[PDB]
Each structure stands twice: as structure tokens, then as C-alpha cells.
Amino acid sequence: TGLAADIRWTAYGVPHIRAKDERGLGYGIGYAYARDNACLLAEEIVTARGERARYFGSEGKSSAELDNLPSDIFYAWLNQPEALQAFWQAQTPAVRQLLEGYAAGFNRFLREADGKTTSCLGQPWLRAIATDDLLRLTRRLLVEGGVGQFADALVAAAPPGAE
Amino acid sequence: SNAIAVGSERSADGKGMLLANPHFPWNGAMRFYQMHLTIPGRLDVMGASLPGLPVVNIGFSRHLAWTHTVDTSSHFTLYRLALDPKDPRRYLVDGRSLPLEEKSVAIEVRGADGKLSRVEHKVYQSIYGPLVVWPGKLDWNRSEAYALRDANLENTRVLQQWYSINQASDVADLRRRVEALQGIPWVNTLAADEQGNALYMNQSVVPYLKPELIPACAIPQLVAEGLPALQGQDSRCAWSRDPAAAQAGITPAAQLPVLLRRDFVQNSNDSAWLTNPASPLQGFSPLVSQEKPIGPRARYALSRLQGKQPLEAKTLEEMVTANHVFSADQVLPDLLRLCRDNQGEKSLARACAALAQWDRGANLDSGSGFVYFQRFMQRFAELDGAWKEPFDAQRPLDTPQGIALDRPQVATQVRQALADAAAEVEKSGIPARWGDLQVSTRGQERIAIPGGDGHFGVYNAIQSVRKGDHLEVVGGTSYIQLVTFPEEGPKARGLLAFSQSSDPRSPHYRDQTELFSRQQWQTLPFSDRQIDADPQLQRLSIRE
Numbered sequence: 001t002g003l004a005a006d007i008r009w010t011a012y013g014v015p016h017i018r019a020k021d022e023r024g025l026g027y028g029i030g031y032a033y034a035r036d037n038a039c040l041l042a043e044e045i046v047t048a049r050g051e052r053a054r055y056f057g058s059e060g061k062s063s064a065e066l067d068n069l070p071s072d073i074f075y076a077w078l079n080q081p082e083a084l085q086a087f088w089q090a091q092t093p094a095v096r097q098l099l100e101g102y103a104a105g106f107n108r109f110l111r112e113a114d115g116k117t118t119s120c121l122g123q124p125w126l127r128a129i130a131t132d133d134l135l136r137l138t139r140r141l142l143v144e145g146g147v148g149q150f151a152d153a154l155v156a157a158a159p160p161g162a163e
Numbered sequence: 164s165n166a167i168a169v170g171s172e173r174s175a176d177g178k179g180m181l182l183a184n185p186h187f188p189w190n191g192a193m194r195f196y197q198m199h200l201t202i203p204g205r206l207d208v209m210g211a212s213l214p215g216l217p218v219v220n221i222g223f224s225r226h227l228a229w230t231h232t233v234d235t236s237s238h239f240t241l242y243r244l245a246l247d248p249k250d251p252r253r254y255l256v257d258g259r260s261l262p263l264e265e266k267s268v269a270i271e272v273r274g275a276d277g278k279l280s281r282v283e284h285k286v287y288q289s290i291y292g293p294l295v296v297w298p299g300k301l302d303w304n305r306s307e308a309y310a311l312r313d314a315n316l317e318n319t320r321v322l323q324q325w326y327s328i329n330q331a332s333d334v335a336d337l338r339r340r341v342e343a344l345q346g347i348p349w350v351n352t353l354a355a356d357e358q359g360n361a362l363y364m365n366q367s368v369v370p371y372l373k374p375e376l377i378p379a380c381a382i383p384q385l386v387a388e389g390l391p392a393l394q395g396q397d398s399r400c401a402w403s404r405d406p407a408a409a410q411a412g413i414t415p416a417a418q419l420p421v422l423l424r425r426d427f428v429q430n431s432n433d434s435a436w437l438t439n440p441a442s443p444l445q446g447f448s449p450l451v452s453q454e455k456p457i458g459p460r461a462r463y464a465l466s467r468l469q470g471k472q473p474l475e476a477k478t479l480e481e482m483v484t485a486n487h488v489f490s491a492d493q494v495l496p497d498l499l500r501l502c503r504d505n506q507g508e509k510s511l512a513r514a515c516a517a518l519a520q521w522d523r524g525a526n527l528d529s530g531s532g533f534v535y536f537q538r539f540m541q542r543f544a545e546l547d548g549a550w551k552e553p554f555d556a557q558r559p560l561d562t563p564q565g566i567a568l569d570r571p572q573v574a575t576q577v578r579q580a581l582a583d584a585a586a587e588v589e590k591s592g593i594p595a596r597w598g599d600l601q602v603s604t605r606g607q608e609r610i611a612i613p614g615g616d617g618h619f620g621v622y623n624a625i626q627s628v629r630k631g632d633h634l635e636v637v638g639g640t641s642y643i644q645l646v647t648f649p650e651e652g653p654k655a656r657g658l659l660a661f662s663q664s665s666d667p668r669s670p671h672y673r674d675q676t677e678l679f680s681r682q683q684w685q686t687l688p689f690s691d692r693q694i695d696a697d698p699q700l701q702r703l704s705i706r707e
């Protein structure tokens with residue numbers, strides 16, 4: 001598209017993104033962010049997709065210290081396709097463009113990465129991202145003052161038996 | 164988190180000034196990242212953001228700086244359901260039995276053999292939202308269960324909200340943009356502008372219940388503990404509707420705390436109440452803001468801010484870099500008296516000497532007195548009626564304070580806490596200063612980190628966990644930004660404490676962390692002139 005950005009970096013790797021529109025601005029953000037934090041974002045998107053158990057088994061935990069399977073159940077429930085679609089449909093053109101640009105810029109970095117700044121190169125979970133994945137992250141953060149604090153409790157909620 | 168906005172009546176230059184000191188994770192989905200965004204002619208903003216978000220979350224622009232702190236407002240309500248006495252998968256609303264809904268999810272699990280298995284899980288839902296179980300507290304038995312309604316699930320405005328903030332010109336504009344949209348999920352906003360306005364807003368997404376409904380709609384035993392919990396068997400306890408709210412069931416902007424001043428506003432995660440004690444914020448819903456005792460970080464900030472002397476940038480910086488352990492102001496004098504009252508008591512000798520020698524700080528060089536103090540305070544926190552002066556609502560800045568050593572049982576219990584704290588410290592393996600113990604691991608190296616837990620009143624709040632022989636930092640001071648507004652353009656200084664990159668391979672994995680260790684803040688370059696003056700300047704243009 002009009003995916004174009006000019007990026008300047010000052011001391012300590014702080015990026016300064018200039019673009020003529022939101023798509024280009026997102027493109028520069030997603031690219032600069034991937035250079036420093038591709039593995040981090042990939043891991044957190046795995047979490048917010050409810051795919052931790054698929055890549056890591058049930059023994060591990062998310063960076064929020066939830067067990068992988070309870071975490072996956074919670075995020076599968078939170079980030080259902082109907083919820084992501086409703087959220088997307090409610091977004092302004094500018095915001096949609098920011099998100100489209102970010103996914104594209106992140107993916108451009110991933111296409112070119114040779115491990116210079118990417119310790120998880122070659123892992124099967126290090127994958128091109130979609131705008132839906134950024135909506136998954138957004139919604140994960142959105143509920144951190146709410147149902148996110150009750151993720152274990154939601155998973156544990158089962159009706160009484162014969163006791 | 165801490166935030167201080169200073170206005171024309173207190174700033175040394177008569178313009179606005181903002182200190183942003185959010186305390187947040189050093190790893191993971193909430194790890195701050197610095198960036199400056201520009202669309203020439205219509206957007207120019209710099210600060211830091213959470214992973215995956217193409218907007219600046221805390222930042223500044225030509226005439227404005229803003230920050231956030233987590234608020235004490237409720238952003239959800241629990242609903243206690245009255246179960247159908249004939250069927251625990253049904254619940255009563257106005258005496259009518261309704262069925263729970265079921266939503267199944269399926270998860271793939273990688274097994275011992277490396278193959279995938281499919282696990283199906285049923286999530287039960289009521290009209291309010293999903294059911295939640297906290298064993299021993301919120302059970303699902305044959306009489307009752309709990310559902311949770313999260314107000315931010317329908318907040319589709321959150322990204323638009325920050326993008327709108329990024330376009331704001333000054334404090335008045337920021338306020339208009341936040342109040343119009345009501346997209347902020349769970350934080351306060353504090354801001355200052357070039358003209359010298361200082362702004363505080365408790366403007367977020369909060370479940371709305373009209374005041375007359377609260378006494379009967381609350382679950383008495385749960386609200387007593389600060390859990391927002393409502394009666395789910397009465398349809399009149401549904402969140403209230405109001406045409407002025409941006410989203411059905413949330414509190415209208417007009418009913419949420421705002422304080423606009425020209426002296427200062429501050430917040431360190433307490434309620435709106437004592438944002439500035441000269442103008443207390445009172446009369447809000449319990450779901451919004453309550454007049455509760457303030458934590459030692461806010462008491463510390465208020466002790467430094469009250470008075471009439473001009474505040475310079477350097478004053479606010481030093482409130483962070485001093486590492487003063489303000490909780491010590493409340494108990495150390497009496498703790499020292501107890502030490503002297505017990506001279507020649509073997510079990511207390513090292514503790515008492517360490518405490519007397521201590522600089523009352525969480526500096527790299529701070530002596531073992533800090534560690535003894537921390538372990539003592541964790542025990543003092545469990546004692547009943549040990550404060551000399553309990554919380555006094557008419558003296559909220561100075562209470563609670565002191566130890567009731569004149570009361571025999573307290574003196575005995577306090578002395579025992581110190582002995583116990585000292586034994587725990589003697590037991591662990593300590594040769595050594597605070598920076599020898601608290602570190603951030605980078606590769607196979609460890610960098611000493613100043614600061615201490617916010618619960619001990621250290622403005623520079625740092626949370627750490629025991630890992631092997633050290634305390635490993637996991638959260639706290641993160642993105643630091645201190646902004647003033649000289650004529651040339653905004654002058655911003657700070658750091659990202661854990662550095663830009665979480666990747667050990669990166670040139671920017673530990674560079675600002677070394678600086679954070681030495682507490683050497685740096686320019687945050689904003690203007691083309693500042694960017695161009697940087698001898699490390701690098702540039703890439705990309706397209707597809």
C-alpha cells in the first residue's frame with residue numbers, strides 16, 4: 001500500500017518515526033519495535049491467542065505467571081472470533097490503518113531477520129502477525145483491571161456435584 | 164506509579180512541569196517501550212507505550228505532557244447469584260429461574276510424546292458475564308455463585324482514546340478529548356502544559372450505579388473489603404443508564420473526579436481524595452473514589468510538595484533519585500528507642516546497630532539497616548493496635564505514625580517482631596550493601612539496582628523476588644519522564660530503566676540499565692535540532 005516510513009534512532013535505540021499517514025506511521029512503529037522486541041511480542045501474541053500449551057505444553061506459564069492451559073482457556077474465551085470482529089468493526093479508519101501498518105512493519109522485520117537482534121530465530125512460534133493479533137493484545141490489556149484479574153477463577157468455575 | 168504535575172504558581176519558571184514515574188513490569192506484555200511519532204503538520208508526540216500498541220501511552224508534545232497511574236476505582240462488578248433451589252445451573256432474577264449459558268473452547272496441548280491433544284473446556288455464563296470461583300471465598304455451591312461484569316469488555320474506544328490524547332494541544336484540550344470519549348480503561352491521568360495548568364483526572368471506564376441503589380444493591384460483607392459486588396437476583400441492581408455516558412452502563416464524565424489547579428496535583432495510586440489537600444475531592448460513588456488512608460509514597464510526595472517555595476525540575480528528579488524510605492519516618496524513631504531500652508540484649512544487637520547506622524535509604528550504598536527494616540515492617544504490618552497515633556481522617560498526611568511502646572503488650576509484641584526479623588536476616592547469607600543484594604540480571608552479569616518496595620514508601624518503587632543468592636527486580640520504575648517547557652521547545656529528561664530491548668543480543672539490552680544503576684537520566688530528544696545534535700544518530704527509510 002502506502003507503507004512507507006522514515007526512521008531515525010537516537011542514543012539508546014530510541015526510534016523517531018516520520019510518515020505521511022497512519023499506515024506508514026504504524027509501518028515504522030512495527031518495524032522498529034520488532035528490531036528490539038520481536039521475540040517478546042511473538043510470545044505475548046501466543047499467550048493472547050491461547051496457544052501456549054500448543055507450543056510449550058501444560059507444564060509452563062505465561063509472563064503473567066498463569067499456567068499455560070488455564071491461560072489458553074481464558075484467552076480463547078476472551079479473544080473469540082466474534083469479539084475480535086466486533087472490536088475491529090468499531091475502530092476508526094485512522095486506528096485500523098495504524099494497526100495494519102504495525103503488522104506489516106513487524107512482518108517486514110521478521111522477513112529480513114538474521115538473528116542480529118533476535119534470540120528466538122527459527123522457533124516455530126516466531127511467526128508473521130495479523131491485525132487480529134494486535135486486537136488480541138489490546139483486549140488482553142483492556143481487561144487487566146477487570147476479568148483479567150479473575151482469569152484463574154473463570155477457569156475454575158464448575159457447578160457443584162453430588163457433595 | 165507516581166505522578167506530579169506542577170503549575171505556574173509553584174514552578175520556578177512560572178510554566179508547567181510534569182514528573183512521570185509509572186511503576187510497571189520489567190518483562191512481558193506490559194513492558195514499556197520508547198518512541199517518538201510524527202506525521203508532519205498534524206501529529207508530533209514522544210513517550211513510551213505498551214507492546215503491540217501503535218500509539219504513545221505516556222508522553223509529551225510541543226505544549227503538553229501527560230502520564231497515568233492505576234486508579235482505585237472499580238472497573239468491574241461481581242454479581243452474587245441466587246441459584247434456583249432445584250437446579251444449581253439456573254439462577255433467579257426477580258424470582259424467575261434463568262438458565263446459565265455455556266460457551267465451550269477447545270485448546271491444543273503438546274503432550275509428553277510431542278503430539279497435540281485437544282482439550283475442551285466449558286465456560287458458564289450468566290446475563291452479567293462469566294462465573295468465577297475463588298475457593299473458600301466465592302464458591303459455586305447449591306445456594307449461590309458469582310458472575311463478573313467487566314466494564315471494559317465493551318470499551319472499543321481505547322486505542323482511539325490514546326491516539327486522541329497524542330493529538331491534544333494543552334491541558335484544556337486533553338480534558339475535552341478524554342471526557343468526550345471515555346476510552347481510558349483503568350488509570351488516572353495527570354498532565355501539565357506550557358501555560359502552567361496542572362490537571363488531575365480520575366476519568367476512566369467505571370460501572371455506573373445511581374447513588375440511591377447502592378445501600379440495597381451492595382453485598383455488605385464484600386464491599387466492606389473493597390470488592391465491588393452487587394446483588395444479582397434483583398434486576399434493579401443492573402448498571403444504571405445515562406444518555407451522557409459514552410457507553411451503556413458506565414459513569415458519565417461529569418460524575419468522575421477532575422482537579423484543575425495552578426499549584427500542583429499528585430497521585431501515587433491512592434484515590435482522588437488528596438490529589439491536592441488544599442482542595443480535597445469528596446462526594447463520589449464508592450465505586451469511584453473513597454476517603455481512605457493514603458500510602459507512604461503519597462505522604463512522602465505531599466511532605467515534599469506542600470509549602471510555597473518554587474519547585475525546579477531538579478527537585479522532582481531528586482524525589483525519585485533520593486531513594487528515601489519514607490515508612491522509616493513513621494517507625495524508626497521509636498524503633499531506635501526500643502533498641503536503647505534493650506541494650507545488651509544479644510539477639511537485638513546487630514539489628515539495632517544496622518538500623519542506627521542506616522541512611523534511611525534504598526541507595527546502592529545503603530547499609531543492611533534497610534533489610535532489617537523491611538523484615539521488621541512485614542511483621543509490624545501484622546500487629547493489632549501497635550501504632551502510637553492511628554489513622555486520623557482530619558490528619559491524613561501525618562497518620563498513622565509512631566509505635567505505642569507505652570502499652571506493655573505492644574512493646575512486647577514489637578520487640579518480638581524485631582528479634583524475629585533479625586533472626587531471619589542473620590540466617591540468609593549476607594557478608595554488604597543494598598546494591599549487593601538487589602539486581603537485574605543481564606546475560607550472565609548482574610547490575611545493581613537502586614530503589615525499594617513502594618509499600619515501604621520509596622518513591623523510586625522497585626519490586627524484587629528472591630532468586631538464588633539475590634533479589635531479582637521484576638517491576639517498578641520503568642519509563643521516567645520529566646518535562647518542562649522553555650521557549651525553544653519541550654525539555655524532557657529521563658530513562659527507560661530496563662532499556663529498549665528485551666533481547667540479550669541487542670545493543671540496547673542493558674545500556675539504560677547501566678545508567679539507571681548510576682541514576683544518570685538523559686535528554687529525551689524531541690525537536691529536529693535535538694535529534695540532529697545526537698552523535699549516535701542513525702536513519703533508515705523503508706517501504707513496501
Ligand SMILES: *C(=O)CCCCCCCCCCCCC
Pocket residue numbers: 137138139141142164165185186187213220221231232233234321348350432
Ligand atoms: C502505575 O500505577 C502504572 C501506570 C501504567 C500506565 C499504563 C499506560 C496506560 C494504560 C494503557 C492501557 C491500554 C489498553 C489497551
